[PDB]
Write a protein that binds this ligand. Structure first.
Ligand SMILES: CNCC[C@H](Oc1ccc(C(F)(F)F)cc1)c1ccccc1
Ligand SMILES: [Cl-]
Ligand SMILES: [Zn+2]
Length: 209
């Protein structure tokens, strides 16, 4: 149990809510801070210890295999993804971030213990809301949402701003506290938690716990 636990995000949205756009942008911003890239987990072909793993469109009813793998990934246990069937060598999983999206209001695992294990691991658990101006027919308008903002915007974690970044088009709502974030703000939060987990103070604290 020598690995720092990945920082994990779950986004709940609807099919047209731009869930995958959101995880892609959050993921890329975080990955760039670590000089790395994003890897989408095929539901481990192509995994190369990328800093950010994305799991898009989690089903509402994961089975025991889904639960088991996810709980390996998001933990402090050394974990070698299964690669034998791909005839590739075993390598330790080291991604410090895992982002997931789902259309489910609530994920329901097979047992309530399983549900507790998932809840423990989704540190950030947010609803996506698309702002009505930027949605037609239940589908987010990407041309509108990617259009560069004027200079009233100066983003923290991106080189330029658009409504996707600063909360004009999409917002993220904490499911426990109802606190609201722009995508940019959420990246700041996720990287702060990463820095917290990797700090000397935190790691030395664990010697006494
Ligand atoms: C095989 N069952 C559906 C595939 C699977 O769905 C999942 C649903 C939930 C979870 C968990 F456990 F909540 F993390 C993990 C996976 C999934 C979805 C997207 C990416 C990887 C795996
Ligand atoms: Cl149980
Ligand atoms: Zn903006």
């Amino acid at each position: 149990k020598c690995r720092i636990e990945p920082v994990c995000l779950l986004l709940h949205g609807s099919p047209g809510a731009g869930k995958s756009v959101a995880t892609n942008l959050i993921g890329r911003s975080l990955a760039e801070k670590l000089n790395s890239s994003v890897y989408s987990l095929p539901p481990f072909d192509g995994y190369k210890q990328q800093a950010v793993v994305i799991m898009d469109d989690l089903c509402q009813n994961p089975d025991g295999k889904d639960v088991s793998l996810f709980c390996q990934m998001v933990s402090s246990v050394d974990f070698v993804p299964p690669m034998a069937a791909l005839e590739e060598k075993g390598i330790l999983f080291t991604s410090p971030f895992v982002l997931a999206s789902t259309n489910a209001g609530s994920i329901n695992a097979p047992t309530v213990s399983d549900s507790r294990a998932l809840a423990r691991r989704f540190h950030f658990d947010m609803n996506i809301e698309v702002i009505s101006m930027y949605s037609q027919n239940g589908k987010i308008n990407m041309p509108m949402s990617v259009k560069t903002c004027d200079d009233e915007c100066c983003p923290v974690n991106f080189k330029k701003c658009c409504p996707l970044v600063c909360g004009k088009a999409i917002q993220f709502i904490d499911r426990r506290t109802q606190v609201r974030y722009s995508l940019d703000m959420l990246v700041t939060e996720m990287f702060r938690e990463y820095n917290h987990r990797h700090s000397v103070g935190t790691t030395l604290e664990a010697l006494f716990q």
